[PDB]
Amino acid sequence: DAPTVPKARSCPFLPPDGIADIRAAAPVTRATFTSGHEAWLVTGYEEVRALLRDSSFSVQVPHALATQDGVVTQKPGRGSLLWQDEPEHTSDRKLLAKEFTVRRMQALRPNIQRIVDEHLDAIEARGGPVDLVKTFANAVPSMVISDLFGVPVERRAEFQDIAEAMMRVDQDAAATEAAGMRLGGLLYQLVQERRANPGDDLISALITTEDPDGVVDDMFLMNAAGTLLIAAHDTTACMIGLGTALLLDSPDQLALLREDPSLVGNAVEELLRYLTIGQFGGERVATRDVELGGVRIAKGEQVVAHVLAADFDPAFVEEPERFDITRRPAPHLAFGFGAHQCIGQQLARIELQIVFETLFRRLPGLRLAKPVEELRFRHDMVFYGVHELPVTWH
Numbered sequence: 001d002a003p004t005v006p007k008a009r010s011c012p013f014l015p016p017d018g019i020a021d022i023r024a025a026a027p028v029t030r031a032t033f034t035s036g037h038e039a040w041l042v043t044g045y046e047e048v049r050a051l052l053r054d055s056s057f058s059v060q061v062p063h064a065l066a067t068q069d070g071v072v073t074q075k076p077g078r079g080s081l082l083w084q085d086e087p088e089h090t091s092d093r094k095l096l097a098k099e100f101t102v103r104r105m106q107a108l109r110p111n112i113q114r115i116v117d118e119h120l121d122a123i124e125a126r127g128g129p130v131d132l133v134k135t136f137a138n139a140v141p142s143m144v145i146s147d148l149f150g151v152p153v154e155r156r157a158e159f160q161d162i163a164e165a166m167m168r169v170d171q172d173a174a175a176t177e178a179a180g181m182r183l184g185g186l187l188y189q190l191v192q193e194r195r196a197n198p199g200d201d202l203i204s205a206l207i208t209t210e211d212p213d214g215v216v217d218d219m220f221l222m223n224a225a226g227t228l229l230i231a232a233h234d235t236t237a238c239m240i241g242l243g244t245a246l247l248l249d250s251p252d253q254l255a256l257l258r259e260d261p262s263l264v265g266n267a268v269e270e271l272l273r274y275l276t277i278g279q280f281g282g283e284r285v286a287t288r289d290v291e292l293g294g295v296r297i298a299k300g301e302q303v304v305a306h307v308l309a310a311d312f313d314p315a316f317v318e319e320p321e322r323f324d325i326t327r328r329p330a331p332h333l334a335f336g337f338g339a340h341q342c343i344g345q346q347l348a349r350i351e352l353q354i355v356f357e358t359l360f361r362r363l364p365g366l367r368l369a370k371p372v373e374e375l376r377f378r379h380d381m382v383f384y385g386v387h388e389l390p391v392t393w394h
């Protein structure tokens with residue numbers, strides 16, 4: 001009856017205490033997870049990469065281990081990617097990737113600058129103190145996605161409100177469901193409206209993409225839009241909030257940043273590694289027997305890629321436990337690895353670069369409004385973060 005995965009953090013910016021010792025002894029081991037099911041726990045950097053690169057592992061798992069019951073909820077179909085296996089994941093990712101290009105993401109920089117400035121304009125008009133989460137972390141990323149999707153500015157308010165409601169988690173089952181149906185309704189109308197009046201947005205591009213093959217219908221488009229939005233919003237928001245929190249709690253690194261603004265890119269990469277916000281890790285099931293770190297994984301067995309522990313493997317980086325923005329960026333696993341690796345990562349990087357540069361330049365002497373020990377952390381969420389971040393500035 002294998003030991004329960006360490007979850008408790010005596011320091012909120014750092015991993016659960018017990019994890020380092022498991023990683024040093026047994027980087028592939030057995031554990032009991034939050035559902036009460038026992039699975040393979042993979043904590044070593046090399047092992048977690050080998051696991052994520054191995055296309056023997058399916059993403060269509062028998063148990064949701066991070067959850068109270070082992071119950072894998074309702075899954076989306078073609079175009080949603082997250083729960084697809086090859087060959088259909090892959091060809092559908094390929095279709096998506098044809099239009100959701102890194103070129104298209106780079107082309108969104110002016111948009112992101114504008115959105116970031118608009119939100120800061122609003123923050124500075126009010127003073128002082130504000131909740132950065134509500135007013136900035138949760139708002140910017142969904143607005144970036146609405147530009148990606150061609151949403152005109154008159155339509156932003158509704159999109160923002162619907163995206164936000166979808167995201168929040170002081171909510172019972174029905175409220176949660178209601179928020180999802182309100183979103184799906186919005187995206188269905190958005191799809192129709194792009195079919196009527198195409199534009200230069202991602203959805204209009206997907207509508208006319210080359211589709212041999214017959215697969216891009218309204219359903220496929222709704223699944224892709226919803227997954228892009230969902231995957232892009234809470235993750236980026238968590239990074240903005242936690243990354244700001246960790247920087248404000250790290251006046252040493254922040255000083256290095258103010259002394260040398262060219263460190264923003266490296267800061268963003270060190271923040272990604274340091275926070276690895278997918279705190280519980282990628283869930284896979286073997287579809288054949290596989291050998292991983294000398295240990296044999298049977299067909300049908302479930303495995304949890306603990307990307308957070310891997311991002312602190314001392315074989316990955318030296319003194320993994322210092323938060324050091326001067327590091328030359330290493331290949332962290334915050335965006336995953338292999339076939340399911342974050343498709344929007346170049347966009348997330350651009351957003352975070354613009355956010356952190358603009359935030360610290362525009363609000364100099366930004367400062368926590370309460371102590372760090374009073375902040376409330378996202379203990380049980382798929383994405384780790386803070387619920388609120390009260391701050392003031394000059």
Ligand code: HEM
Pocket residue numbers: 081082083089093227228229231232233235236237239277278281282283334335336337339340341342343344345347348
């Ligand atoms: C800000 C930080 C973000 C993090 C830390 C993150 C993390 C991830 C991870 C860890 C995966 C792999 C999941 C797994 O292997 O189980 C993934 C996939 C995905 N991400 Fe991100 N993401 C972030 C931002 C974004 C943005 C801006 C977008 C999209 C516009 C995005 C869109 C997606 C999509 C559709 C997938 C699934 C890809 C597939 O399954 O083939 N993410 N993300």
